[PDB]
Ligand binder design. Structure first.
Ligand SMILES: Cc1cc2c3c(c1C)C(C)(C)C[C@@H](O)N3c1c(nc(O)[nH]c1=O)N2C[C@H](O)[C@H](O)[C@H](O)COP(=O)(O)O
Ligand SMILES: Cc1cc2c3c(c1C)C(C)(C)C[C@@H](O)N3c1c(nc(O)[nH]c1=O)N2C[C@H](O)[C@H](O)[C@H](O)COP(=O)(O)O
Ligand SMILES: [K+]
Ligand SMILES: [K+]
Ligand SMILES: [Mn+2]
Ligand SMILES: [Mn+2]
Lengths: 496, 496
């Protein structure tokens, strides 16, 4: 099976790329595996594969850390991500996001049911497993539980059967046969859970699949539209129907090659303690106490020599930056274009801790609109901040065509030099806010509302007659014939 | 003479450091010298010394570019700057700024008059020079003149004789015996020129000295207080009285070892075209047209084999970032402390194009103040934005003690995650603004007023009971004994 369609094949691909380190000596799931992975993420090192995890019971489990994190070189920086998608390892961010958006103008390709797969190689019933006995990691020293679920896919279906959602949401072990985790608006797991709670008759049939097809985990992390079944979007994106097996204890379908599958229910009534958890913005608030949703596990199925992927999330750079930020930005790009806004590109700068998105504007199109900053900012903010794709994003930065939004230094430059604080900005207080950002949930204002801004880093003539400056830089302040001479004589003269 | 007291000795020091490239083949002052220097600044390369400048007349002149720019290594990043000040080349930014502030609590050491010096080796009178015939650089392709003055020191004295100011302000060649340049509030050259215009009797006696003692050019770039003679501050800072010679045609005093000295007058009446000029924020607006102050040159004196320093300013990183930003930040630190604000450190992040200053707060002291964000922001902004040291700075970012303000990634992290847009900020519209920032002078609002903000990236408990988080990073989310094990086994395991 190809790497984008089978996690096991993805792990080989990383080895083959010289992008893996296999660690075959004993590693402790209490902090050590996550500390090594954290270090990898902070230094853009090779992904760690922990083949010898202290406490591995019943063949459960090895760990792969940093599955979607960065490589050190600029040339293949996003190569781990490209390997999720059958793209060359030198793919740009633009190319990766275009690939993730491509299925939005394609018919879905529904999945294919197969009678078995590797995820059925082993099983443990209700009398045989105990989640507290597995080598579930403690990821951060102050976490309130062992977060088994950082890179698996929750599978839930609407009561009417018409929408099956795949998404990533964190969850931790509660007891031998339950998890807890947050199920919060506007996320699709929450929208579906609300449908089941309004029906009132039963708990939500649920599965959590770990080590799924890489292309599937990418869609799981992207805010594709309400009502759209991820499996058919991934099928369209990859050009092939995904192979799924039925769960044993319910009628959901999981990827055939899933490394580990939990089957059970997500309660419509019960809650239990969750968190705190070290999170994407780089923080943990030890001691925070809160009741989350409760999941019951009835069955585990798994591959021989099963591998659990793990995100050791926090400060730059990990999956919560490379996937959450970038994939939101992609969806925001499309959303703006669909609302007739002249946006060509969008990216969530890592330097903003993926709380900003920079929107590159086609300024020829802007000029033909014959509008002003105050009107354009309001239009863009109304579109994005009232949509689920904007949920995680608190600052939008509008930039003209000279700025590469995929380059954080250029976004910073434009923001700092082209957007007058206050006057060039519109604040949005009556929109949903993201409580996870410390200034929101642990800040001075409402945790769930407001705190958003559109910052216009378009210059005045960009709305009227066109750009009226040149950069004071090597590229723009010197003619081509001189630049080339300089470059051709650089090492001759003594420079590096 | 030591490198910090003699420019010629500074150039040797750079060679000796392996921080110079001597270029002995012909280089064109029309763009080529500045293009090479621009490239150096954008890549943190060695300083270029152009020993063979096309059009060098009467021994005038060689050029040193990038005199105060960065080195490539992290270990001696600020070494060029350290060489201005007798500091080790590994000095930190903190150490450099402390050195620049040290004289603020010392008696001045007045200069010593000597009868001659190297700056008298050669002379050209009013019938012998022509500024349009010298190899003055064109620094950026769209500049409105050849900016002879980018790293010399203007010398002007109050009418009463009691204050002699040394400062850097750009100036360009107007004609064979005049320069033009901006003389604008609140700068000390402008405050002095206003005193002479109010007296109304004569033009301002003036000198411009190029290739001055490095410690002197540093003070020339720092906003030390009104009325304080830079020469006595530099004397105190260095521990020695600076040696000065009298000008021939007026009674001002110039450093004895100056490479090139212009003597003349700054008019109280006449103006002439100036600019446009590629500037510190990374822009030029070609065609901008404006009348600047006019300077008459009556005499040139110079060293044998005179060297003109040149700043090829623009996008990161050059003297306009390393000196203007950092030295303003230093003065702002002191100003805050003198106003009983608990600020321990200040720095202008390069990533903000030195338009922000990050202020590190002693949060134990803050807690004892028993105040709130809204009150503290207003207090800090009132102190800084109503003072000349705040002129160039449009955003202040308050951060707690865990943030290293000299590290732009950490400042960005704190700003993005701890300051709620709008609610955690106070806008200041009734303060002097810096028109040079594009969003000011080429923006949507008043060019000279407003556009400033204090952004509070202190978390709520930092005002009350203390920090209530830990970072989700390698340093803070793992115990010391584990961290050390990881580090000790890193290369063993296969990582880099
Ligand atoms: C890639 C990735 C995504 C997410 C998460 C993680 C990773 C690695 C964790 C490490 C587990 C940290 C966590 O905060 N986390 C997370 C989460 N969304 C949540 O509701 N809850 C979460 O706990 N997303 C984001 C969501 O996956 C996306 O917002 C997606 O759009 C949701 O799908 P849908 O609702 O649009 O179908
Ligand atoms: C280091 C340095 C400082 C300055 C400048 C440059 C360099 C290299 C130029 C390359 C020439 C670019 C230019 O914009 N420039 C510049 C300038 N101040 C001005 O009023 N005008 C200027 O044209 N400063 C800043 C001032 O030197 C400081 O603000 C100083 O504080 C002034 O001294 P004082 O008035 O406080 O005595
Ligand atoms: K999804
Ligand atoms: K000065
Ligand atoms: Mn969905
Ligand atoms: Mn001064």
């Amino acid at each position: 099976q190809p790497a984008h369609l089978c996690f096991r094949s993805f792990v080989e691909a990383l080895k083959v790329d010289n992008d893996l380190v296999e660690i075959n000596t004993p590693i402790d799931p209490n902090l050590e595996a996550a500390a090594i992975t954290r270090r990898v993420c902070e230094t853009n090192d090779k992904a760690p594969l922990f083949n010898n995890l202290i406490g591995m019971k019943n063949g459960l489990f090895r760990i792969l850390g940093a599955p979607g994190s960065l490589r050190k070189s600029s040339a293949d920086r996003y190569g781990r991500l490209a390997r999720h998608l059958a793209l060359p390892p030198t793919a740009s961010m633009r190319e990766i996001l275009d690939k993730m958006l491509s299925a939005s103008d394609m018919p879905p390709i529904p999945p294919t049911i197969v009678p078995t797969g590797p995820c059925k190689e082993n099983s443990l019933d209700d009398s045989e497993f105990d989640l507290t006995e597995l080598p579930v990691p403690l990821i951060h020293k102050s976490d309130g539980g062992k977060y088994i679920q950082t890179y698996g896919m929750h599978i839930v279906q609407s009561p009417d059967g018409t929408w099956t959602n795949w998404s990533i949401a964190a969850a931790m072990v509660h007891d031998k046969n339950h998890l807890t985790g947050l199920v919060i608006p506007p996320q699709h797991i929450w929208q579906i859970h609300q449908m089941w709670k309004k029906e009132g008759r039963s708990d939500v049939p649920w599965a959590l699949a770990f080590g799924v097809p890489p292309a599937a985990i990418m869609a799981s992390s992207m805010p594709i539209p309400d009502g759209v079944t991820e499996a058919g979007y991934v099928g369209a994106m990859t050009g092939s129907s995904l192979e799924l097996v039925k769960c044993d204890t319910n009628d959901l379908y999981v990827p055939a090659t899933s490394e580990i599958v939990l089957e059970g229910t997500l309660s419509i009534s019960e809650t239990g303690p969750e968190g705190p958890f070290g999170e994407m913005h780089g923080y943990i608030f030890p001691g925070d106490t809160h009741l989350g949703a409760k999941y019951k596990v009835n069955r585990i199925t798994y591959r021989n020599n099963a591998i659990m992927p793990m995100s050791s999330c926090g400060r730059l750079t990990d999956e919560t930056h490379t996937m959450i930020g970038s994939l939101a930005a992609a969806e925001i790009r499309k959303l703006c274009q669909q609302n007739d806004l002249p946006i060509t590109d969008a990216f969530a700068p890592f330097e903003s801790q993926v709380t900003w998105v920079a929107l590159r504007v086609d300024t020829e199109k802007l000029r033909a609109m014959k509008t002003t900053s105050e009107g354009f900012r309001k239009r863009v903010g109304d579109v994005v901040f009232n949509h689920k794709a904007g949920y995680t994003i608190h600052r939008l930065v509008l930039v003209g065509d000279d700025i590469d939004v995929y380059e954080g230094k250029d976004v910073l430059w434009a923001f700092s030099t082209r957007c007058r604080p206050g006057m060039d900005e519109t604040l949005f207080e009556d929109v949903r806010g993201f409580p996870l950002i410390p200034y929101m949930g642990h800040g001075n204002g409402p945790a769930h509302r407001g705190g958003k801004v559109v910052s216009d880093a378009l210059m005045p003539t960009e709305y009227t007659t066109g750009r009226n400056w040149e950069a004071a830089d090597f590229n723009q302040s010197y003619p081509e014939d001189l630049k080339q001479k300089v470059l051709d004589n650089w090492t001759k003269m003594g420079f590096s």
